[PDB]
Amino acid sequence: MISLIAALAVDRVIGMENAMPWNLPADLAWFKRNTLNKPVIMGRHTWESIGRPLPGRKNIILSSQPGTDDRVTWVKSVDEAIAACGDVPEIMVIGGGRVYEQFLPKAQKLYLTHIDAEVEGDTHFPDYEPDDWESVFSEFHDADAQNSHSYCFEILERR
Ligand SMILES: NC(=O)c1ccc[n+]([C@@H]2O[C@H](COP(=O)([O-])OP(=O)(O)OC[C@H]3O[C@@H](n4cnc5c(N)ncnc54)[C@H](OP(=O)(O)O)[C@@H]3O)[C@@H](O)[C@H]2O)c1
Ligand SMILES: Nc1nc(=O)c2nc(CNc3ccc(C(=O)N[C@@H](CCC(=O)O)C(=O)O)cc3)cnc2[nH]1
Ligand SMILES: [Mn+2]
Ligand SMILES: [Mn+2]
Ligand SMILES: [Mn+2]
């Protein structure tokens, strides 16, 4: 099973200038809980944005060019990325925009954080078709001293 996990600001913005400009510790904790002990697939730009391997996860990087770091696994196509995960129950696709586009048609589950923040950005999560997806979990949180925007954790499953 393939799942996508992402945090979306208003208008599906996910990034600006190869960064995420907000800081929501509660959402990073949610990301860690839902990805730990699973393989994670990311594109090369997202790898450069994170800047280091994510511990406790098999890190698989998509790039058309040879890898430059043997602490992670480098693959050259979507099918190779999936194969490199082996026989696991759930593969997590962690972006960015171009990678989400390619894996969306193959995904059964979306883990989305909706952040109440207006962000100028240059990268968006794909338009998906709402009729294809059932919301199976949602949890709203007001802003607090640690998290400066309100946010909604949602899990959607392909109908
Ligand atoms: N808010 C969130 O949830 C979230 C999550 C992830 C990322 N982001 C943000 O998203 C932005 C990065 O997204 P992006 O769309 O620019 O880039 P991306 O999807 O991270 O990376 C694209 C790169 O991945 C490689 N790639 C993708 N598909 C491939 C394929 N089928 N075969 C081979 N290589 C492939 C290519 O690398 P080569 O050029 O080396 O071939 C391509 O240039 C940043 O702003 C980041 O902060 C946000
Ligand atoms: N909901 C969501 N939020 C995100 O921030 C997110 N980020 C990415 C890609 N970028 C990043 C950037 C940093 C870290 C990171 O530092 N993660 C630590 C945080 C642990 C914690 O704060 O408790 C990790 O070990 O996962 C992960 C992904 C992909 N999907 C996402 N999905
Ligand atoms: Mn092929
Ligand atoms: Mn197999
Ligand atoms: Mn806000």
Side-chain angles (χ1 to χ4, degrees), residues 5-8 14-20 22 42-46 49 62-65 75-78 94-100 102 122-123:
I5 183 158
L8 279 57
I14 63 170
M16 180 53 177
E17 293 173 316
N18 215 41
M20 301 185 306
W22 61 79
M42 72 192 89
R44 183 188 49 92
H45 296 325
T46 295
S49 182
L62 276 157
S63 176
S64 66
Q65 298 311 317
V75 298
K76 301 189 192 297
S77 67
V78 168
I94 73 166
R98 296 291 299 175
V99 170
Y100 289 136
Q102 291 169 85
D122 55 27
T123 310

PDB file of all heavy atoms in Angstrom, residues 5-8 14-20 22 42-46 49 62-65 75-78 94-100 102 122-123, ligand 1:
ATOM      1  N   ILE A   5       1.883  11.630   2.575  1.00  0.00           N
ATOM      2  CA  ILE A   5       1.760  12.473   3.746  1.00  0.00           C
ATOM      3  C   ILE A   5       2.273  13.848   3.363  1.00  0.00           C
ATOM      4  O   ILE A   5       3.317  13.957   2.722  1.00  0.00           O
ATOM      5  CB  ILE A   5       2.489  11.879   4.975  1.00  0.00           C
ATOM      6  CG1 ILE A   5       2.290  12.753   6.207  1.00  0.00           C
ATOM      7  CG2 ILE A   5       3.971  11.636   4.699  1.00  0.00           C
ATOM      8  CD1 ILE A   5       2.515  11.998   7.535  1.00  0.00           C
ATOM      9  N   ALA A   6       1.531  14.896   3.730  1.00  0.00           N
ATOM     10  CA  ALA A   6       1.865  16.254   3.386  1.00  0.00           C
ATOM     11  C   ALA A   6       1.181  17.207   4.352  1.00  0.00           C
ATOM     12  O   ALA A   6       0.135  16.893   4.929  1.00  0.00           O
ATOM     13  CB  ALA A   6       1.386  16.586   1.976  1.00  0.00           C
ATOM     14  N   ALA A   7       1.751  18.394   4.458  1.00  0.00           N
ATOM     15  CA  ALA A   7       1.146  19.530   5.162  1.00  0.00           C
ATOM     16  C   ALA A   7       0.896  20.646   4.152  1.00  0.00           C
ATOM     17  O   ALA A   7       1.813  21.074   3.468  1.00  0.00           O
ATOM     18  CB  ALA A   7       2.085  20.013   6.273  1.00  0.00           C
ATOM     19  N   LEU A   8      -0.351  21.098   4.095  1.00  0.00           N
ATOM     20  CA  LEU A   8      -0.840  22.056   3.110  1.00  0.00           C
ATOM     21  C   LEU A   8      -1.281  23.328   3.806  1.00  0.00           C
ATOM     22  O   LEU A   8      -2.101  23.275   4.724  1.00  0.00           O
ATOM     23  CB  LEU A   8      -2.090  21.508   2.408  1.00  0.00           C
ATOM     24  CG  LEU A   8      -1.877  20.515   1.259  1.00  0.00           C
ATOM     25  CD1 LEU A   8      -1.103  19.302   1.658  1.00  0.00           C
ATOM     26  CD2 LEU A   8      -3.237  20.132   0.707  1.00  0.00           C
ATOM     27  N   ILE A  14       2.612  24.025  -0.481  1.00  0.00           N
ATOM     28  CA  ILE A  14       3.463  23.155   0.327  1.00  0.00           C
ATOM     29  C   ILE A  14       4.890  23.655   0.465  1.00  0.00           C
ATOM     30  O   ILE A  14       5.645  23.087   1.259  1.00  0.00           O
ATOM     31  CB  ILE A  14       3.448  21.691  -0.161  1.00  0.00           C
ATOM     32  CG1 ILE A  14       4.004  21.545  -1.575  1.00  0.00           C
ATOM     33  CG2 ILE A  14       2.066  21.116  -0.023  1.00  0.00           C
ATOM     34  CD1 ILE A  14       4.239  20.118  -2.032  1.00  0.00           C
ATOM     35  N   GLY A  15       5.310  24.659  -0.288  1.00  0.00           N
ATOM     36  CA  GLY A  15       6.690  25.081  -0.187  1.00  0.00           C
ATOM     37  C   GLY A  15       6.931  26.404  -0.857  1.00  0.00           C
ATOM     38  O   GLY A  15       6.126  26.870  -1.668  1.00  0.00           O
ATOM     39  N   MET A  16       8.051  27.011  -0.489  1.00  0.00           N
ATOM     40  CA  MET A  16       8.506  28.230  -1.135  1.00  0.00           C
ATOM     41  C   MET A  16      10.022  28.243  -1.083  1.00  0.00           C
ATOM     42  O   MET A  16      10.614  28.101  -0.009  1.00  0.00           O
ATOM     43  CB  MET A  16       7.960  29.472  -0.432  1.00  0.00           C
ATOM     44  CG  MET A  16       8.409  30.785  -1.075  1.00  0.00           C
ATOM     45  SD  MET A  16       8.081  30.870  -2.855  1.00  0.00           S
ATOM     46  CE  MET A  16       8.630  32.529  -3.226  1.00  0.00           C
ATOM     47  N   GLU A  17      10.639  28.431  -2.244  1.00  0.00           N
ATOM     48  CA  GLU A  17      12.103  28.540  -2.353  1.00  0.00           C
ATOM     49  C   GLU A  17      12.805  27.357  -1.684  1.00  0.00           C
ATOM     50  O   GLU A  17      13.789  27.502  -0.948  1.00  0.00           O
ATOM     51  CB  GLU A  17      12.586  29.896  -1.841  1.00  0.00           C
ATOM     52  CG  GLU A  17      12.104  31.043  -2.733  1.00  0.00           C
ATOM     53  CD  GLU A  17      12.418  32.425  -2.181  1.00  0.00           C
ATOM     54  OE1 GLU A  17      12.222  32.656  -0.966  1.00  0.00           O
ATOM     55  OE2 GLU A  17      12.853  33.284  -2.971  1.00  0.00           O
ATOM     56  N   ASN A  18      12.274  26.167  -1.953  1.00  0.00           N
ATOM     57  CA  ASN A  18      12.792  24.884  -1.469  1.00  0.00           C
ATOM     58  C   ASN A  18      12.766  24.764   0.049  1.00  0.00           C
ATOM     59  O   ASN A  18      13.544  24.005   0.638  1.00  0.00           O
ATOM     60  CB  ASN A  18      14.164  24.509  -2.030  1.00  0.00           C
ATOM     61  CG  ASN A  18      14.285  23.007  -2.251  1.00  0.00           C
ATOM     62  OD1 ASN A  18      13.336  22.379  -2.723  1.00  0.00           O
ATOM     63  ND2 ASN A  18      15.409  22.416  -1.856  1.00  0.00           N
ATOM     64  N   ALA A  19      11.837  25.463   0.692  1.00  0.00           N
ATOM     65  CA  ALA A  19      11.715  25.421   2.130  1.00  0.00           C
ATOM     66  C   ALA A  19      10.243  25.391   2.502  1.00  0.00           C
ATOM     67  O   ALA A  19       9.357  25.565   1.655  1.00  0.00           O
ATOM     68  CB  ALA A  19      12.370  26.647   2.769  1.00  0.00           C
ATOM     69  N   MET A  20       9.979  25.080   3.772  1.00  0.00           N
ATOM     70  CA  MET A  20       8.672  25.274   4.383  1.00  0.00           C
ATOM     71  C   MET A  20       8.833  26.419   5.375  1.00  0.00           C
ATOM     72  O   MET A  20       9.618  26.287   6.325  1.00  0.00           O
ATOM     73  CB  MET A  20       8.212  24.000   5.101  1.00  0.00           C
ATOM     74  CG  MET A  20       8.104  22.777   4.192  1.00  0.00           C
ATOM     75  SD  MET A  20       7.420  21.295   4.983  1.00  0.00           S
ATOM     76  CE  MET A  20       8.479  21.087   6.428  1.00  0.00           C
ATOM     77  N   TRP A  22       6.825  27.904   7.625  1.00  0.00           N
ATOM     78  CA  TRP A  22       6.176  27.836   8.919  1.00  0.00           C
ATOM     79  C   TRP A  22       6.929  26.880   9.835  1.00  0.00           C
ATOM     80  O   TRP A  22       7.846  26.166   9.427  1.00  0.00           O
ATOM     81  CB  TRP A  22       4.715  27.391   8.778  1.00  0.00           C
ATOM     82  CG  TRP A  22       4.549  26.022   8.171  1.00  0.00           C
ATOM     83  CD1 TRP A  22       4.697  24.824   8.800  1.00  0.00           C
ATOM     84  CD2 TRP A  22       4.215  25.726   6.812  1.00  0.00           C
ATOM     85  NE1 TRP A  22       4.497  23.794   7.913  1.00  0.00           N
ATOM     86  CE2 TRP A  22       4.181  24.320   6.688  1.00  0.00           C
ATOM     87  CE3 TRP A  22       3.939  26.511   5.686  1.00  0.00           C
ATOM     88  CZ2 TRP A  22       3.875  23.686   5.489  1.00  0.00           C
ATOM     89  CZ3 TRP A  22       3.642  25.878   4.497  1.00  0.00           C
ATOM     90  CH2 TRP A  22       3.613  24.476   4.407  1.00  0.00           C
ATOM     91  N   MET A  42      11.178  10.192  -1.350  1.00  0.00           N
ATOM     92  CA  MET A  42      11.173  11.628  -1.582  1.00  0.00           C
ATOM     93  C   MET A  42      11.934  11.944  -2.848  1.00  0.00           C
ATOM     94  O   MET A  42      12.803  11.193  -3.297  1.00  0.00           O
ATOM     95  CB  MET A  42      11.798  12.347  -0.388  1.00  0.00           C
ATOM     96  CG  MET A  42      13.306  12.181  -0.271  1.00  0.00           C
ATOM     97  SD  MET A  42      13.968  12.745   1.299  1.00  0.00           S
ATOM     98  CE  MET A  42      13.812  11.245   2.232  1.00  0.00           C
ATOM     99  N   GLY A  43      11.627  13.100  -3.415  1.00  0.00           N
ATOM    100  CA  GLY A  43      12.392  13.605  -4.534  1.00  0.00           C
ATOM    101  C   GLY A  43      13.663  14.292  -4.082  1.00  0.00           C
ATOM    102  O   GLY A  43      13.843  14.652  -2.928  1.00  0.00           O
ATOM    103  N   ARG A  44      14.530  14.555  -5.048  1.00  0.00           N
ATOM    104  CA  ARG A  44      15.847  15.097  -4.719  1.00  0.00           C
ATOM    105  C   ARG A  44      15.746  16.484  -4.087  1.00  0.00           C
ATOM    106  O   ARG A  44      16.527  16.810  -3.198  1.00  0.00           O
ATOM    107  CB  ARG A  44      16.752  15.120  -5.942  1.00  0.00           C
ATOM    108  CG  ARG A  44      18.156  15.619  -5.589  1.00  0.00           C
ATOM    109  CD  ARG A  44      19.070  15.845  -6.778  1.00  0.00           C
ATOM    110  NE  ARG A  44      18.463  16.624  -7.857  1.00  0.00           N
ATOM    111  CZ  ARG A  44      18.537  17.943  -8.005  1.00  0.00           C
ATOM    112  NH1 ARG A  44      19.134  18.710  -7.110  1.00  0.00           N
ATOM    113  NH2 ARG A  44      18.004  18.504  -9.087  1.00  0.00           N
ATOM    114  N   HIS A  45      14.807  17.321  -4.540  1.00  0.00           N
ATOM    115  CA  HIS A  45      14.699  18.648  -3.947  1.00  0.00           C
ATOM    116  C   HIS A  45      14.300  18.571  -2.487  1.00  0.00           C
ATOM    117  O   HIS A  45      14.830  19.307  -1.650  1.00  0.00           O
ATOM    118  CB  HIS A  45      13.716  19.547  -4.696  1.00  0.00           C
ATOM    119  CG  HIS A  45      14.115  19.852  -6.093  1.00  0.00           C
ATOM    120  ND1 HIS A  45      15.426  20.011  -6.476  1.00  0.00           N
ATOM    121  CD2 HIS A  45      13.366  20.083  -7.194  1.00  0.00           C
ATOM    122  CE1 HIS A  45      15.472  20.304  -7.763  1.00  0.00           C
ATOM    123  NE2 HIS A  45      14.238  20.337  -8.224  1.00  0.00           N
ATOM    124  N   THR A  46      13.376  17.677  -2.157  1.00  0.00           N
ATOM    125  CA  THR A  46      12.970  17.502  -0.766  1.00  0.00           C
ATOM    126  C   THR A  46      14.115  16.960   0.076  1.00  0.00           C
ATOM    127  O   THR A  46      14.313  17.397   1.202  1.00  0.00           O
ATOM    128  CB  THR A  46      11.691  16.668  -0.713  1.00  0.00           C
ATOM    129  OG1 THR A  46      10.658  17.418  -1.333  1.00  0.00           O
ATOM    130  CG2 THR A  46      11.295  16.346   0.699  1.00  0.00           C
ATOM    131  N   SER A  49      16.149  19.838   0.912  1.00  0.00           N
ATOM    132  CA  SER A  49      15.465  20.698   1.870  1.00  0.00           C
ATOM    133  C   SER A  49      15.558  20.152   3.286  1.00  0.00           C
ATOM    134  O   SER A  49      15.767  20.915   4.235  1.00  0.00           O
ATOM    135  CB  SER A  49      14.005  20.862   1.450  1.00  0.00           C
ATOM    136  OG  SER A  49      13.328  21.728   2.329  1.00  0.00           O
ATOM    137  N   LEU A  62      14.461   9.710  -5.135  1.00  0.00           N
ATOM    138  CA  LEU A  62      14.329   9.688  -6.572  1.00  0.00           C
ATOM    139  C   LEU A  62      15.197  10.777  -7.191  1.00  0.00           C
ATOM    140  O   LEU A  62      15.095  11.954  -6.827  1.00  0.00           O
ATOM    141  CB  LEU A  62      12.875   9.945  -6.953  1.00  0.00           C
ATOM    142  CG  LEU A  62      11.993   8.732  -6.924  1.00  0.00           C
ATOM    143  CD1 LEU A  62      10.536   9.134  -6.742  1.00  0.00           C
ATOM    144  CD2 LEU A  62      12.151   7.947  -8.231  1.00  0.00           C
ATOM    145  N   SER A  63      16.019  10.386  -8.152  1.00  0.00           N
ATOM    146  CA  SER A  63      16.787  11.333  -8.937  1.00  0.00           C
ATOM    147  C   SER A  63      17.168  10.659 -10.245  1.00  0.00           C
ATOM    148  O   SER A  63      17.435   9.461 -10.270  1.00  0.00           O
ATOM    149  CB  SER A  63      18.061  11.760  -8.210  1.00  0.00           C
ATOM    150  OG  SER A  63      18.872  12.612  -9.021  1.00  0.00           O
ATOM    151  N   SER A  64      17.208  11.440 -11.316  1.00  0.00           N
ATOM    152  CA  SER A  64      17.699  10.906 -12.578  1.00  0.00           C
ATOM    153  C   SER A  64      19.213  10.773 -12.617  1.00  0.00           C
ATOM    154  O   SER A  64      19.745  10.142 -13.544  1.00  0.00           O
ATOM    155  CB  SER A  64      17.255  11.800 -13.734  1.00  0.00           C
ATOM    156  OG  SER A  64      17.868  13.070 -13.631  1.00  0.00           O
ATOM    157  N   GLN A  65      19.925  11.350 -11.673  1.00  0.00           N
ATOM    158  CA  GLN A  65      21.375  11.331 -11.700  1.00  0.00           C
ATOM    159  C   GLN A  65      21.917  10.483 -10.559  1.00  0.00           C
ATOM    160  O   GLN A  65      21.203  10.188  -9.594  1.00  0.00           O
ATOM    161  CB  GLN A  65      21.932  12.758 -11.609  1.00  0.00           C
ATOM    162  CG  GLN A  65      21.520  13.654 -12.779  1.00  0.00           C
ATOM    163  CD  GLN A  65      21.749  13.008 -14.142  1.00  0.00           C
ATOM    164  OE1 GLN A  65      22.782  12.383 -14.385  1.00  0.00           O
ATOM    165  NE2 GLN A  65      20.776  13.153 -15.033  1.00  0.00           N
ATOM    166  N   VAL A  75      17.283   5.895  -6.355  1.00  0.00           N
ATOM    167  CA  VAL A  75      16.597   5.172  -7.416  1.00  0.00           C
ATOM    168  C   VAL A  75      16.270   6.150  -8.541  1.00  0.00           C
ATOM    169  O   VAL A  75      16.195   7.360  -8.343  1.00  0.00           O
ATOM    170  CB  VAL A  75      15.326   4.462  -6.905  1.00  0.00           C
ATOM    171  CG1 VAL A  75      15.684   3.416  -5.851  1.00  0.00           C
ATOM    172  CG2 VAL A  75      14.340   5.472  -6.331  1.00  0.00           C
ATOM    173  N   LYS A  76      16.035   5.594  -9.733  1.00  0.00           N
ATOM    174  CA  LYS A  76      15.886   6.395 -10.941  1.00  0.00           C
ATOM    175  C   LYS A  76      14.485   6.377 -11.550  1.00  0.00           C
ATOM    176  O   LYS A  76      14.286   6.992 -12.596  1.00  0.00           O
ATOM    177  CB  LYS A  76      16.909   5.951 -11.996  1.00  0.00           C
ATOM    178  CG  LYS A  76      18.335   6.083 -11.533  1.00  0.00           C
ATOM    179  CD  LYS A  76      19.308   5.834 -12.685  1.00  0.00           C
ATOM    180  CE  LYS A  76      20.740   5.673 -12.210  1.00  0.00           C
ATOM    181  NZ  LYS A  76      21.270   6.904 -11.560  1.00  0.00           N
ATOM    182  N   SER A  77      13.517   5.693 -10.946  1.00  0.00           N
ATOM    183  CA  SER A  77      12.158   5.641 -11.472  1.00  0.00           C
ATOM    184  C   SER A  77      11.198   5.292 -10.351  1.00  0.00           C
ATOM    185  O   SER A  77      11.604   4.752  -9.311  1.00  0.00           O
ATOM    186  CB  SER A  77      12.021   4.608 -12.599  1.00  0.00           C
ATOM    187  OG  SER A  77      12.188   3.302 -12.081  1.00  0.00           O
ATOM    188  N   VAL A  78       9.917   5.560 -10.590  1.00  0.00           N
ATOM    189  CA  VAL A  78       8.871   5.228  -9.637  1.00  0.00           C
ATOM    190  C   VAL A  78       8.848   3.733  -9.347  1.00  0.00           C
ATOM    191  O   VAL A  78       8.756   3.310  -8.186  1.00  0.00           O
ATOM    192  CB  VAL A  78       7.514   5.730 -10.173  1.00  0.00           C
ATOM    193  CG1 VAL A  78       6.372   5.161  -9.387  1.00  0.00           C
ATOM    194  CG2 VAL A  78       7.478   7.255 -10.143  1.00  0.00           C
ATOM    195  N   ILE A  94       6.723  11.207   0.778  1.00  0.00           N
ATOM    196  CA  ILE A  94       6.860  12.412   1.560  1.00  0.00           C
ATOM    197  C   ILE A  94       7.189  13.636   0.701  1.00  0.00           C
ATOM    198  O   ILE A  94       7.559  14.672   1.227  1.00  0.00           O
ATOM    199  CB  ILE A  94       7.821  12.263   2.757  1.00  0.00           C
ATOM    200  CG1 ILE A  94       9.291  12.197   2.305  1.00  0.00           C
ATOM    201  CG2 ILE A  94       7.448  11.024   3.572  1.00  0.00           C
ATOM    202  CD1 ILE A  94      10.271  12.381   3.433  1.00  0.00           C
ATOM    203  N   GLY A  95       6.971  13.546  -0.608  1.00  0.00           N
ATOM    204  CA  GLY A  95       7.010  14.704  -1.480  1.00  0.00           C
ATOM    205  C   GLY A  95       8.315  14.824  -2.239  1.00  0.00           C
ATOM    206  O   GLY A  95       9.147  13.920  -2.230  1.00  0.00           O
ATOM    207  N   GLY A  96       8.498  15.933  -2.941  1.00  0.00           N
ATOM    208  CA  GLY A  96       7.674  17.145  -2.964  1.00  0.00           C
ATOM    209  C   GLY A  96       6.619  17.133  -4.046  1.00  0.00           C
ATOM    210  O   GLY A  96       6.059  16.070  -4.345  1.00  0.00           O
ATOM    211  N   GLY A  97       6.314  18.314  -4.596  1.00  0.00           N
ATOM    212  CA  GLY A  97       5.202  18.426  -5.526  1.00  0.00           C
ATOM    213  C   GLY A  97       5.256  17.457  -6.687  1.00  0.00           C
ATOM    214  O   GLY A  97       4.265  16.799  -7.009  1.00  0.00           O
ATOM    215  N   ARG A  98       6.402  17.390  -7.368  1.00  0.00           N
ATOM    216  CA  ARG A  98       6.498  16.528  -8.539  1.00  0.00           C
ATOM    217  C   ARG A  98       6.318  15.067  -8.153  1.00  0.00           C
ATOM    218  O   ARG A  98       5.642  14.305  -8.852  1.00  0.00           O
ATOM    219  CB  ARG A  98       7.851  16.730  -9.241  1.00  0.00           C
ATOM    220  CG  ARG A  98       8.087  18.137  -9.825  1.00  0.00           C
ATOM    221  CD  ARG A  98       7.198  18.483 -11.031  1.00  0.00           C
ATOM    222  NE  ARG A  98       7.388  17.607 -12.184  1.00  0.00           N
ATOM    223  CZ  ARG A  98       6.663  17.653 -13.295  1.00  0.00           C
ATOM    224  NH1 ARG A  98       5.726  18.564 -13.476  1.00  0.00           N
ATOM    225  NH2 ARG A  98       6.856  16.731 -14.232  1.00  0.00           N
ATOM    226  N   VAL A  99       6.920  14.659  -7.039  1.00  0.00           N
ATOM    227  CA  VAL A  99       6.786  13.285  -6.572  1.00  0.00           C
ATOM    228  C   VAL A  99       5.355  12.972  -6.155  1.00  0.00           C
ATOM    229  O   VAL A  99       4.834  11.908  -6.498  1.00  0.00           O
ATOM    230  CB  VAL A  99       7.805  13.019  -5.450  1.00  0.00           C
ATOM    231  CG1 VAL A  99       7.559  11.694  -4.744  1.00  0.00           C
ATOM    232  CG2 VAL A  99       9.199  13.046  -6.051  1.00  0.00           C
ATOM    233  N   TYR A 100       4.685  13.883  -5.434  1.00  0.00           N
ATOM    234  CA  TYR A 100       3.295  13.628  -5.072  1.00  0.00           C
ATOM    235  C   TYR A 100       2.430  13.411  -6.311  1.00  0.00           C
ATOM    236  O   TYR A 100       1.563  12.550  -6.304  1.00  0.00           O
ATOM    237  CB  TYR A 100       2.720  14.795  -4.274  1.00  0.00           C
ATOM    238  CG  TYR A 100       3.224  14.996  -2.861  1.00  0.00           C
ATOM    239  CD1 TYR A 100       3.542  16.247  -2.417  1.00  0.00           C
ATOM    240  CD2 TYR A 100       3.300  13.948  -1.960  1.00  0.00           C
ATOM    241  CE1 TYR A 100       3.928  16.476  -1.107  1.00  0.00           C
ATOM    242  CE2 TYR A 100       3.686  14.158  -0.657  1.00  0.00           C
ATOM    243  CZ  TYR A 100       4.011  15.419  -0.234  1.00  0.00           C
ATOM    244  OH  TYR A 100       4.432  15.692   1.044  1.00  0.00           O
ATOM    245  N   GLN A 102       3.193  12.083  -9.143  1.00  0.00           N
ATOM    246  CA  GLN A 102       3.404  10.781  -9.736  1.00  0.00           C
ATOM    247  C   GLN A 102       2.838   9.653  -8.911  1.00  0.00           C
ATOM    248  O   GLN A 102       2.432   8.635  -9.459  1.00  0.00           O
ATOM    249  CB  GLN A 102       4.892  10.556  -9.974  1.00  0.00           C
ATOM    250  CG  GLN A 102       5.438  11.433 -11.055  1.00  0.00           C
ATOM    251  CD  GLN A 102       6.915  11.359 -11.064  1.00  0.00           C
ATOM    252  OE1 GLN A 102       7.504  10.475 -11.672  1.00  0.00           O
ATOM    253  NE2 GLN A 102       7.545  12.248 -10.334  1.00  0.00           N
ATOM    254  N   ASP A 122       5.625  28.427  -4.193  1.00  0.00           N
ATOM    255  CA  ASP A 122       5.937  28.058  -5.559  1.00  0.00           C
ATOM    256  C   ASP A 122       5.727  26.580  -5.824  1.00  0.00           C
ATOM    257  O   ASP A 122       6.045  26.122  -6.926  1.00  0.00           O
ATOM    258  CB  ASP A 122       7.380  28.451  -5.911  1.00  0.00           C
ATOM    259  CG  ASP A 122       8.394  27.883  -4.942  1.00  0.00           C
ATOM    260  OD1 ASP A 122       8.132  26.834  -4.321  1.00  0.00           O
ATOM    261  OD2 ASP A 122       9.469  28.494  -4.796  1.00  0.00           O
ATOM    262  N   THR A 123       5.230  25.829  -4.845  1.00  0.00           N
ATOM    263  CA  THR A 123       4.993  24.404  -4.972  1.00  0.00           C
ATOM    264  C   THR A 123       3.648  24.116  -4.330  1.00  0.00           C
ATOM    265  O   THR A 123       3.354  24.622  -3.238  1.00  0.00           O
ATOM    266  CB  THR A 123       6.097  23.598  -4.256  1.00  0.00           C
ATOM    267  OG1 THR A 123       7.379  24.069  -4.679  1.00  0.00           O
ATOM    268  CG2 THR A 123       5.987  22.131  -4.587  1.00  0.00           C
TER     269      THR A 123
HETATM  270  N1  LIG B   1       4.571  20.714   3.094  1.00  0.00           N
HETATM  271  C1  LIG B   1       4.934  19.474   2.779  1.00  0.00           C
HETATM  272  O1  LIG B   1       4.293  18.545   3.154  1.00  0.00           O
HETATM  273  C2  LIG B   1       6.111  19.238   1.928  1.00  0.00           C
HETATM  274  C3  LIG B   1       6.560  17.940   1.709  1.00  0.00           C
HETATM  275  C4  LIG B   1       7.634  17.709   0.890  1.00  0.00           C
HETATM  276  C5  LIG B   1       8.240  18.777   0.261  1.00  0.00           C
HETATM  277  N2  LIG B   1       7.790  20.017   0.453  1.00  0.00           N
HETATM  278  C6  LIG B   1       8.370  21.163  -0.265  1.00  0.00           C
HETATM  279  O2  LIG B   1       8.270  20.821  -1.652  1.00  0.00           O
HETATM  280  C7  LIG B   1       9.318  21.510  -2.382  1.00  0.00           C
HETATM  281  C8  LIG B   1      10.087  20.516  -3.242  1.00  0.00           C
HETATM  282  O3  LIG B   1       9.167  19.952  -4.226  1.00  0.00           O
HETATM  283  P1  LIG B   1       9.539  19.889  -5.778  1.00  0.00           P
HETATM  284  O4  LIG B   1       8.289  19.549  -6.515  1.00  0.00           O
HETATM  285  O5  LIG B   1      10.323  21.089  -6.172  1.00  0.00           O
HETATM  286  O6  LIG B   1      10.579  18.679  -5.859  1.00  0.00           O
HETATM  287  P2  LIG B   1      10.587  17.135  -5.446  1.00  0.00           P
HETATM  288  O7  LIG B   1       9.366  16.501  -5.917  1.00  0.00           O
HETATM  289  O8  LIG B   1      11.071  17.023  -4.027  1.00  0.00           O
HETATM  290  O9  LIG B   1      11.883  16.678  -6.235  1.00  0.00           O
HETATM  291  C9  LIG B   1      11.850  16.631  -7.680  1.00  0.00           C
HETATM  292  C10 LIG B   1      13.111  15.943  -8.158  1.00  0.00           C
HETATM  293  O10 LIG B   1      12.996  14.540  -7.870  1.00  0.00           O
HETATM  294  C11 LIG B   1      13.512  13.762  -8.934  1.00  0.00           C
HETATM  295  N3  LIG B   1      12.443  12.963  -9.502  1.00  0.00           N
HETATM  296  C12 LIG B   1      11.104  13.115  -9.374  1.00  0.00           C
HETATM  297  N4  LIG B   1      10.468  12.179 -10.019  1.00  0.00           N
HETATM  298  C13 LIG B   1      11.409  11.373 -10.606  1.00  0.00           C
HETATM  299  C14 LIG B   1      11.358  10.234 -11.404  1.00  0.00           C
HETATM  300  N5  LIG B   1      10.172   9.665 -11.789  1.00  0.00           N
HETATM  301  N6  LIG B   1      12.510   9.687 -11.790  1.00  0.00           N
HETATM  302  C15 LIG B   1      13.645  10.245 -11.411  1.00  0.00           C
HETATM  303  N7  LIG B   1      13.804  11.315 -10.657  1.00  0.00           N
HETATM  304  C16 LIG B   1      12.664  11.873 -10.284  1.00  0.00           C
HETATM  305  C17 LIG B   1      14.154  14.742  -9.920  1.00  0.00           C
HETATM  306  O11 LIG B   1      15.509  14.903  -9.465  1.00  0.00           O
HETATM  307  P3  LIG B   1      16.692  15.188 -10.515  1.00  0.00           P
HETATM  308  O12 LIG B   1      16.508  16.669 -10.975  1.00  0.00           O
HETATM  309  O13 LIG B   1      17.930  14.966  -9.731  1.00  0.00           O
HETATM  310  O14 LIG B   1      16.480  14.102 -11.639  1.00  0.00           O
HETATM  311  C18 LIG B   1      13.301  15.998  -9.677  1.00  0.00           C
HETATM  312  O15 LIG B   1      13.963  17.197 -10.067  1.00  0.00           O
HETATM  313  C19 LIG B   1      10.168  22.234  -1.321  1.00  0.00           C
HETATM  314  O16 LIG B   1       9.663  23.562  -1.149  1.00  0.00           O
HETATM  315  C20 LIG B   1       9.845  21.431  -0.059  1.00  0.00           C
HETATM  316  O17 LIG B   1      10.058  22.203   1.100  1.00  0.00           O
HETATM  317  C21 LIG B   1       6.758  20.260   1.252  1.00  0.00           C
END
